């Protein structure tokens, strides 16, 4: 069995790659950047915005993890091509080359400001960022390809995933900020925003379990939340990171939106319900939001 | 107040145009084909697949009705560009040029094989065609633009709309078939498929009412079903059309899918719930599905 991982060189994807090699799969990495970790993995540099990206590339299953992950309105076209056109180009390659299954990296942002927290998968699409819209659009398209062409689609709605090699997000930004100036930490928003953080090891294991189980179901489409069970405030994240570095910076709140978000489209409060994932797979997290945040801070502290 | 109508030269759009001129609006028509009916309407030939389509075009409200309406899998990229990229290009023009409102032509296909018939707007996206996916994707994007940029979005989910100038769909196809050969009528599917048909006059009036009322609400996004209250079987449509023409053709059923659909992705049974539309606006249909079908047959019979 051949597994293609798009975005294989990036954060979650690379972890996915390593784990798939170990378990015995013939792994194909497709990414716009090079990563030459060793291993069995057949390497391809391609741009998924190109319809013809997958020429001469063959797999039975694709993990589609190529995207631009940054939520931060100003340049929606880049989001559009990177997140919408690229996903369509993946699904067209899957259709025409006999790929059986798509595992799609989705996101908690598909829910927007959710009406129920912890958020169940039954909650409707209400995204508030162009990135959330692009993920929801991707989900709809991959589900349709499932129903119409039999390219079954597991949409995995990730909350924040944190660990070694992460190069985006609050922990990474906070660390990079204190590196430039240790005395001041600018924090976007009103400091009160609260989100779950799942350590990468836990995320990978929930993803692979859910995939295995999806394969023994026959629903054309399944959407599954993969996140932690608790949340951490941004101010608490600021302290954890500061402590790891041995620092006590001046915390400067940056006003941005009437309602205290860090930027327009920033969801302030998020925790996903992981009942379905637990039920279906027997998966549990091995860390809390706080522990995952601290461990990642330590990881990125030594890398960066 | 300036109203831009994309797809202004086509079936629903042109009717929308004429009606908007009468009521006093400064109307701007944007379409890839020319239509020179007279009137106040400022005319533009543009391709909405072009990001720069709306250069020098200004409006306070857009009715976005430019699309490829054909559901009939084989060429999804054309659907993608025509229905997804074009809608994104409209929304980007609306954002950057101070447009206040989008009226988006959506479709009953966003529901797929609906679990409840008549289908309420609360029913989730389960499209079974690439066209349905593209409409659902459009809805998600325009809703997000509403929430994020204040470009409020009325998504109008049309069931079949039928009348003068219609050049696609079953009635048009049946007529064109009997014109080529009056003795044989090929009917796709198992003949049992059942759908509502709303006469164009009724559709236009429900659209303009819902728009007026949407403007006095403050929900960023509203999705509204606009359809008839009853359905007609394809075989009954075949007879109505045949009778209008004075004909009794041999009815030949064409097998296509294990489950009797005319093609993969063809929804067999559809009727939308129009409670919300009635409640909000005091709108009623003036015809039945059967009457609208017969009247359209007569209309297209004399045009074609
Ligand atoms: N990390 C999280 O917390 C999280 C949460 C929710 C969803 N996700 C989704 O997980 C997936 C990856 O997340 P990540 O954090 O690893 O980000 P990342 O940036 O580390 O990984 C993405 C990889 O995609 C590649 N890529 C981008 N555009 C490409 C293109 N056009 N063609 C080929 N390759 C391209 C990038 O080079 C990168 O290596 C994305 O879909 C992301 O939106 C991540
Ligand atoms: N007619 C119905 O029963 C019905 C039902 C549900 C939804 N809708 C939606 O209503 C809208 C119009 O339906 P219709 O039946 O009038 O179809 P139509 O083909 O008569 O009208 C569409 C118009 O869009 C124009 N167009 C297409 N691509 C374009 C582009 N790239 N740039 C500029 N113009 C372009 C076409 O030239 C045409 O004049 C579409 O969004 C359709 O999907 C119609
Ligand atoms: O430099 C920063 C960066 C972020 N924040 C704030 O702290 C919170 C950070 O929350 P997240 O950890 O969720 O970071 P993002 O909002 O950037 O992450 C979002 O995008 C991710 C991918 O980048 C995932 O999709 C994830 O599901 C989604 O929450 C936000 O409310 C933000 O306002 C700051 O104050 N300063
Ligand atoms: O030549 C034909 C054409 C259609 N049919 C059958 O009769 C039914 C026709 O139903 P519709 O009137 O709904 O026609 P479409 O399925 O082509 O229309 C669909 O696409 C439309 C735009 O083209 C609208 O979006 C509408 O909501 C959606 O039902 C279908 O089940 C189809 O299988 C035939 O037998 N022969």
UniProtKB/TrEMBL annotation, chains A, B:
InterPro entries: Epimerase_deHydtase, NAD(P)-bd_dom_sf, Sc_DH/Rdtase_CS
Cystine connections: 142-153
Matches recorded under Gene3D superfamilies: NAD(P)-binding Rossmann-like Domain, UDP-galactose 4-epimerase, domain 1
Binding residues for UDP-alpha-D-galactose: 69, 107, 160, 188, 193, 195, 197, 266
CDD domains with a match to the protein in the record: UDP_G4E_2_SDR_e
Domain NAD-dependent epimerase/dehydratase positions: 3-220
KW Nucleotide-binding (keyword) present: yes
GO MF annotations in UniProt: nucleotide binding
Keywords noted in UniProt: Nucleotide-binding
Source domain of life: Archaea
Binding sites annotated in the UniProt record for NAD(+): 11-12, 47-48, 65, 67, 82, 131, 135, 159, 161, 168
Any Pfam family the entry gives: Epimerase
Family: Belongs to the NAD(P)-dependent epimerase/dehydratase family.
Stated name of the protein: NAD-dependent epimerase/dehydratase
């Amino acid at each position: 069995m051949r597994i293609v991982v798009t975005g294989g060189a990036g954060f979650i994807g690379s972890h996915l790659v390593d784990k798939l090699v170990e378990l015995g799969y013939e792994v194909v990495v497709v990414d716009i950047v090079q990563r030459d970790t060793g291993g069995s993995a057949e390497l391809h540099v391609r741009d998924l915005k190109d319809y013809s990206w997958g020429a001469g590339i063959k797999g039975d299953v694709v993990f589609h993890f190529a995207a631009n992950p940054e939520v931060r309105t100003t340049e929606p076209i880049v989001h559009f091509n990177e997140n919408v056109v690229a996903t369509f180009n993946v699904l067209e390659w899957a259709r025409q080359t006999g790929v059986r299954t798509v595992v799609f990296a989705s996101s908690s942002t598909v829910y927007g400001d959710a009406d129920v927290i912890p958020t169940p998968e039954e909650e409707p699409y209400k995204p508030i960022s162009v990135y959330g819209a692009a993920k929801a659009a991707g989900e709809v398209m991959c589900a349709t390809y499932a129903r119409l062409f039999g390219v079954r689609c597991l949409a995995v709605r990730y909350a924040n995933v944190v660990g070694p090699r992460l190069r985006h997000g609050v922990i990474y930004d906070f660390i990079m900020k204190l590196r430039r100036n240790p005395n001041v930490l600018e924090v976007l928003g009103d400091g009160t925003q609260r989100k779950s953080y799942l350590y990468v090891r836990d995320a990978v294991e929930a993803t692979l379990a859910a995939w295995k189980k999806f394969e023994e179901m026959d629903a054309p489409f399944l959407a599954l939340n993969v996140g932690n069970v608790d949340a951490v405030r941004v101010l608490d994240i600021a302290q954890i990171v500061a402590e790891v570095l041995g620092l006590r910076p001046e915390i400067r709140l940056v006003p941005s939106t009437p309602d205290g978000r860090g930027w327009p489209g920033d969801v302030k409060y998020m925790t996903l319900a992981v009942t379905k994932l637990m039920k279906l797979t027997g998966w549990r997290p091995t860390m809390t939001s706080a522990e995952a945040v601290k461990k990642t801070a330590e990881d990125l502290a030594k890398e960066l």
